[PDB]
Amino acid sequence: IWKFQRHDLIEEYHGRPAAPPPFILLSHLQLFIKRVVLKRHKQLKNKLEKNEEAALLSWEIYLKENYLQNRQFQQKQRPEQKIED
Amino acid sequence: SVTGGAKNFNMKPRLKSIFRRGLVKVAQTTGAWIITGGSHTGVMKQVGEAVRDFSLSSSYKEGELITIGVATWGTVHRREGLIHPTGSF
């Protein structure tokens, strides 16, 4: 539960700016005028390139069948299965 | 040396499974030389695909299953671009 709860503070502090609260106003004015005149970080969420993504999808979909074979192989080794056989 | 049907080839899925694991598994350990006809159609296409994805999935492993194709010079589509009189390096 602590390992689970580790994430959100890191999420906050990546979202939190780097100025101390005595000097967070310099960021505050810039963000307020930026949203007055006019987005997550790429290190947490990013639209990848489509051809890169296709290569990635083919890679993992290749690995899936490699998982499945050993999965059913070890699942054959339960003793109830040998009794049935 | 694998041989098969080129233009008019159809296969059940069970036959397809052996090409993915049986041919590649026995080629990759011994350091084989898969020699076949050089064509994009049929069985030679199946060997060509089933050896490619191994090289991607190898995760920067050393060595590649070397493959040599032999086809006739007559029945090539765009071979007029291939003839260079000097050394086409």
Curated annotation (Swiss-Prot), chain B:
Write out the residues that bind ADP-D-ribose 1. Answer: 3, 8
Q: What would changing residue 44 to A do, according to UniProt? A: Abolishes lowering of temperature threshold for activation in response to reactive oxygen species. Abolishes channel activation in response to ADPR/Ca(2+)
Q: Where in the cell is it found?
A: Cell membrane; Perikaryon; Cell projection; Cytoplasmic vesicle
How is expression of this protein distributed across tissues? Highly expressed in brain and peripheral blood cells, such as neutrophils. Also detected in bone marrow, spleen, heart, liver and lung. Isoform 2 is found in neutrophil granulocytes.
* Quaternary structure annotation from Swiss-Prot or TrEMBL: Homotetramer. Isoform 1 can interact with isoform 3. This interaction decreases Ca(2+) influx through isoform 1 and suppresses susceptibility to oxidative stress-induced cell death.
Family, as annotated = Belongs to the transient receptor (TC 1.A.4) family. LTrpC subfamily. TRPM2 sub-subfamily.
Q: What is known of its domains?
A: Contains two binding sites for ADP-ribose, one in the N-terminal part of the channel and the other in the C-terminal nudix hydrolase domain. Both sites seem to have a role in channel opening, but the interaction of ADP-ribose with the N-terminal site is absolutely required for channel activation.
> What is the protein name given in its UniProt record?
Transient receptor potential cation channel subfamily M member 2
Source organism: Homo sapiens
Identify the gene encoding this protein: TRPM2
Location of this fragment in the whole protein: 172 to 260 of 1503
